[PDB]
TrEMBL record:
Protein's name in the database: Fe-hydrogenase
InterPro entries, A to Z: Cytosolic_Fe-S_CAF (IPR050340), Fe_hydrogenase (IPR009016), Fe_hydrogenase_lsu_C (IPR004108), Fe_hydrogenase_ssu (IPR003149)
Keyword Transcription: no
Annotated binding of [4Fe-4S] cluster, by residue: C101, C156, C337, C341
Modification Cysteine sulfinic acid (-SO2H) occurs at: C24
Presence of keyword Glycoprotein: no
Organism the protein comes from: Chlamydomonas reinhardtii (Chlamydomonas smithii)
Modified residues (Cysteine sulfenic acid (-SOH)): C100, C169
Location of the Iron hydrogenase small subunit domain: 350-409
């Protein structure tokens, strides 16, 4: 039985059935914008809450926004970056690579195992949310993890292999998956139509909060610009005490699918970061000790060099020049898909050459695009850490939200 068939089997069970399980679903933003195309409509032609209603009509007991998991990734990865930056100032290496794309993680383990220490140990947004629901939420609702089923709807054909990583399980039992089944945008679209469900004709439903209390998806109003940018912002604003605006990446000449930006950071006055810049300034990626600037009275500062690679072919050319020292970066994100997740392998096929641009544009409302969201300000995220996880990068956070990598692959 395919994973789609297994999830549908769990849903086919009446809710009052003695063997019925608590079936949960989480949905990626890339899915929500592209799902309307399965009806022959434009991207974004169906609202988020219409999809929520549709999923609830399939029989899901919980409907979650993957963005909640993304806030956890931003928290952990932002802290991780700040940590590595900190220990490199006072003399887990640099540059740091992000790790949300399983296509990158796969290529990392098979072709570049010597780069493993440089990669963030953060789990993906979907896996963090999954680990959370079968731990915190299970305990809150008095449900055994074995009686909870976690489904994700993804734009990606690789998110199942990510989920199937052996140790992504509960209490060292690899049969108790943190995330059981992954369904693609087109597969979900096919399920709706085969049941006569038209999303565009549905009323607005509502999301569930992974914290098990309150209303909404447990995510505040506004946008972050994605995990990488928000992780950067997290580190930046703690380091400088000043807000980081939305990033504008510029294309690197001579390199396809590579974008970059330079971010200058002056430590906040009186901070530990100001002490470290002052009191001390004298592998496969040996890293030049950083890009720093200073001046007359000692306005000491460091320049964070960031790169983004789409996709895997273009990424190899970047790594080559990095090892050659021709490309110098501190923070690198590698996505397997040329257009990123909005153009993932699980997305509808279109004749429109600009379909990925339409998807991106329709991702959020002009209202939401104008408002900056910060993960550490999310009351649900604050509560989860204060009352359950402890500190980011800590013991509990490492066990539930972090992972490891295997040289040679799995
Ligand atoms: S870039 Fe492609 S392969 Fe990587 S996470 Fe996004 S959809 Fe999946
Ligand atoms: Cl994810």
């Amino acid at each position: 039985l395919s994973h789609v068939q297994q999830a549908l089997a769990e849903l086919a069970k009446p809710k009052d059935d003695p063997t019925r399980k608590h079936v949960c679903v989480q949905v990626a933003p890339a899915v929500r914008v592209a799902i309307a195309e399965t009806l022959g409509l434009a991207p974004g032609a169906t609202t988020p809450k219409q999809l929520a209603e549709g999923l609830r009509r399939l029989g899901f007991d919980e409907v979650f926004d993957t963005l909640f998991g993304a806030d956890l990734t931003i928290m952990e990865e932002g802290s991780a970056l700040l940590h590595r930056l900190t220990e490199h100032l006072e003399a887990e290496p640099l540059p740091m690579f992000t790790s949300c794309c399983p296509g990158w993680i796969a290529m990392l383990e098979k072709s570049y195992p010597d780069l493993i220490p440089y990669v963030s140990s953060c789990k993906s947004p979907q896996m963090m949310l999954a680990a959370m629901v079968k731990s915190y939420l299970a305990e809150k609702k008095g449900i055994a993890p074995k009686d909870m089923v976690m489904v994700s709807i993804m734009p990606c054909t690789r998110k199942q292999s990510e989920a199937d990583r052996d140790w992504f399980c509960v209490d060292a039992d690899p049969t108790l998956r943190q995330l059981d089944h992954v369904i693609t945008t087109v597969e979900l679209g096919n399920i709706f139509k085969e049941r006569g469900i038209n999303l565009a004709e549905l009323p607005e439903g509502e999301w569930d909060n992974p914290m098990g209390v309150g209303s909404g998806a447990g995510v505040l109003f506004g946008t972050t610009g994605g995990v990488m940018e928000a992780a950067l912002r997290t580190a930046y604003e703690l380091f400088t005490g000043t807000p980081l605006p939305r990033l504008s990446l510029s294309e690197v000449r001579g390199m396809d699918g590579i974008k970059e930006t330079n971010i200058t950071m002056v430590p906040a006055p009186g901070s530990k970061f100001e002490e470290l810049l002052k009191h001390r300034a004298a592998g496969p990626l040996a890293w030049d000790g950083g890009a720093g600037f200073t001046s007359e009275d000692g306005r000491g500062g460091i320049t964070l060099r960031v790169a983004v690679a789409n996709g895997l072919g273009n990424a190899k050319k970047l790594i080559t020049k990095m090892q050659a020292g021709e490309a110098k970066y501190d923070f690198v994100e590698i996505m397997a898909c040329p257009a990123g997740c909005v153009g993932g392998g699980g997305q509808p096929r279109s004749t429109d050459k600009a379909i990925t641009q339409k998807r991106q544009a329709a991702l959020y409302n002009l209202d939401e695009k104008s408002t900056l969201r910060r993960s550490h300000e999310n009351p649900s995220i604050r509560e989860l850490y204060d009352t359950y996880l402890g500190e980011p990068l800590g013991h509990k956070a490492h066990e539930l939200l972090h992972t490891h990598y295997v040289a040679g692959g799995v």
